[PDB]
Structure 1
Amino acid sequence: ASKRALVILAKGAEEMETVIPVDVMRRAGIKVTVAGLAGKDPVQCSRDVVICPDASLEDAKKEGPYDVVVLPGGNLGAQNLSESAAVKEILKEQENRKGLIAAICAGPTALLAHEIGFGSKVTTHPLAKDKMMNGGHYTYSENRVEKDGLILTSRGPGTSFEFALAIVEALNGKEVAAQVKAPLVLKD
């Protein structure tokens, strides 16, 4: 009866956009797997923080399905996500089974690369807007967090807490999200 989250961690990922959702989701009792795109080896993030994943993506793929798949941002991290066939397969499968897909900052550009959720309203970091909107396959929003159907997007490192709590609310409900939020000393 425990919900499960998959966080895909690639070289160049924004480490704040990775750690905040992982931390907050585990505070919510969600079982989170931080999966390395390239294997189990440590991952050097965009600002040189080195994180050890819980598993390779290859192994985590076999222990699905996941209630949410989370794509952190970081320009180079998102490019690596966009180029990976393994990510394409995971996202398409998640879209087919109507599971939640969450991406932040530059992360949503991987959805375009893999043709995921076309027709949805999405947000990105302002600097990633042009890339996300190439072709007009989505409708753009400037909301700090945006949720359209099963696609949940957010804008940047400074929206990471709101992004993570939106995932908790979607998975575990509004009361758990509120309980988890209080000890964090968030402003609003």
Structure 2
Amino acid sequence: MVKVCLFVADGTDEIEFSAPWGIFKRAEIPIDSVYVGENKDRLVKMSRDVEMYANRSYKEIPSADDFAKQYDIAIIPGGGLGAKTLSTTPFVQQVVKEFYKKPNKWIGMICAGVLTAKTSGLPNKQITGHPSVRGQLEEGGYKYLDQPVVLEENLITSQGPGTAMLFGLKLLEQVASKDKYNAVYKSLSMP
């Protein structure tokens, strides 16, 4: 059974957090929110001011190697300020570098969260992200695709709050059986 880590920081976007969270919960696949921040109660101020608790602090996990024995999917959501913090945290970079190209691991990044590919020195060729980070990614030698969701190797990237459902679904698609994926998909009333 696959387990998912949804990273979260102060300033993480509520929509981009909620889509993969709700999708993996519907799929009955374990998922933990893992806070990168200093609040000792794991209380998070989200990008648009929702105050919510995370399940864990990243300080509970000693290394990317230990992280990899705990989780199979690592998700880095966006929101301007949350993405800045996540993309500049050495631990998150180490996890991303460790997971990349592993046959039993997957990475998701959405909106400004995709800056983590660049900061982690990932060598994928093609990518998407929020149009506001397009310049930054093309400087990193990435070919930017203007579409909701991109997959290269085991890195799923996505554009923004409007694509967070498609992003969560693409991650689920990698680990769910056909019947589980189809059932979850059908339950969402996708447009």
User: TM (normalized to structure 2)?
Assistant: 0.90
User: CA 1:63/1:121 → structure 2, altered by over 3 Å: closer, same or farther?
Assistant: closer
2:110 aligned with 1:111:
no
**Alpha-carbon separation, structure 2, partners of 1:174 and 1:139:** 31
Instruction: Kindly provide the CA deviation profile for residues 96-144 of structure 1, in whole angstroms up to 9, marking residues without a partner as x.
Output: 634211011111111101112x2331100111111122232x2111121
Unaligned runs of 5+ in 1: none
User: CA 1:162/1:135 → structure 2, altered by over 3 Å: closer, same or farther?
Assistant: closer
User: CA 1:31/1:10 → structure 2, altered by over 3 Å: closer, same or farther?
Assistant: same
**Alpha-carbon separation, structure 2, partners of 1:158 and 1:25:** 18
2:186 aligned with 1:185:
no
User: CA 1:14/1:125 → structure 2, altered by over 3 Å: closer, same or farther?
Assistant: same
RMSD of aligned C-alpha atoms? 1.6
Instruction: Kindly provide the CA deviation profile for residues 129-162 of structure 1, in whole angstroms up to 9, marking residues without a partner as x.
Output: 11122232x2111121111111101111011111
- Mean alpha-carbon deviation: is it higher for 124-133 or for 96-105? 96-105
Residue type matched to 2:140 in 1? G
- CA-CA distance at 1:64 after TM superposition: 3.9
Aligned match of 2:2: 3
Aligned match of 2:46: 45
**Alpha-carbon separation, structure 2, partners of 1:60 and 1:173:** 29
Aligned match of 2:58: 57
- CA-CA distance at 1:58 after TM superposition: 2.2
Aligned match of 1:95: 100
Percentage of matched positions with identical amino acids: 28
**Alpha-carbon separation, structure 1, partners of 2:178 and 2:160:** 23
User: TM (normalized to structure 1)?
Assistant: 0.91
- CA-CA distance at 1:172 after TM superposition: 1.0
Tell me, yes or no, if the aligned pair for 1:120 and 1:149 is still in contact at 8 Å: no
Paired residues, number: 184
Tell me, yes or no, if the aligned pair for 2:129 and 2:159 is still in contact at 8 Å: yes
Aligned match of 2:176: 172
**Alpha-carbon separation, structure 1, partners of 2:26 and 2:52:** 19
Unaligned runs of 5+ in 2: none
Residue type matched to 2:19 in 1? I
The 3-state SS of whatever aligns with 1:97 is: coil
- Mean alpha-carbon deviation: is it higher for 89-98 or for 99-108? 89-98
Of 137, 149, 152, the match for 1:145: 149
User: CA 1:33/1:64 → structure 2, altered by over 3 Å: closer, same or farther?
Assistant: farther
